[PDB]
Amino acid sequence: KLHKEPATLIKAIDGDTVKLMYKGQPMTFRLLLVDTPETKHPKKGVEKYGPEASAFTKKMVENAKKIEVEFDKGQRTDKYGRGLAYIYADGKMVNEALVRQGLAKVAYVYNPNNTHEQHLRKSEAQAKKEKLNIWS
């Protein structure tokens, strides 16, 4: 079973990436299962809804009383050294919140880190249906 652990916000970096203090260790965390428009995307640069998805994540974590990380059951860091987790802001999952606002798409998943994939696909379908932001 998955469990949430405490972390401390250091700095939000993008819509899908935040830097946290985890177990006395400064780390960059990549949000599991979501692809958000980017402001600092390798080739494309600043994509549409990038600043929005970025401001949303930032607001959500910065105004939180408690930040928690929940690792899935597969590997916990990607090839770039980024922790792969579901991030919770005062009990609300940032990953799902972005998808629900149409500020993110559910990422292509196959590997063992897929526990909340269905839940996210449900929020994305709702967001699409409501024609929100990315889906407008």
39 marked among binding-site residues: no
Architecture of domain 1-136 in this structure:
Beta Barrel (2.40)
Resolution in units of Å: 2.0
Give pairs for 38-44: CB < 8 Å, separation 24+.
38/14, 39/14, 39/15, 40/14
14 marked among binding-site residues: no
78 close to 84: Cβ distance less than 8 angstroms? yes
- Per the annotation, the verdict on 100 as an active-site residue is no
Active-site annotation holder among 38, 52, 68, 96: 38
Q: What is the DSSP string of 72-104?
A: -SS-SB-TTS-EEEEEEETTEEHHHHHHHTTS-
16 marked among binding-site residues: yes
Active-site annotation holder among 47, 70, 76, 82: 82
The whole-angstrom separation of Cα 68 and Cα 4 is: 6
The whole-angstrom separation of Cα 117 and Cα 121 is: 6
